[PDB]
């Protein structure tokens, strides 16, 4: 019961890293869409 | 002490599913804002 609970946590920790890395990419991806939004504004208005 | 630790993990796992589903929707939502950004560029520049 102990060991399996430690294995549950490894999984949780593993999935959490995945989450954090994806979020990092989402934030940069959002940085880029912001640039484009603001760029299109300059040309046009 | 064992049982409550297993209940903590159920919660954690539950909140983690919520997180992953929200992120899925955020990625598609970002796919859509990308389309619109690029579309507006074509018309204008």
């Amino acid at each position: 019961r102990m060991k399996q609970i430690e294995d549950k946590i490894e999984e949780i920790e593993s999935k959490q890293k995945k989450i954090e890395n994806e979020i990092a990419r989402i934030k940069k991806l959002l940085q880029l869409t912001v640039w484009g939004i603001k760029q299109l504004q300059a040309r046009i208005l | 002490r064992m049982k409550q630790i297993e209940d903590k993990i159920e919660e954690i796992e539950s909140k983690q599913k919520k997180i992953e589903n929200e992120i899925a929707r955020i990625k598609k939502l970002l796919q859509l804002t990308v389309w619109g950004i690029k579309q507006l560029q074509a018309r204008i520049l």
Partner: peptide, 12 residues
């Protein structure tokens, strides 16, 4: 805008 576009598919 190419860097912008290269980066788009890059981080996605």
């Amino acid at each position: 805008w190419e860097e912008w576009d290269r980066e788009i598919e890059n981080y996605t």
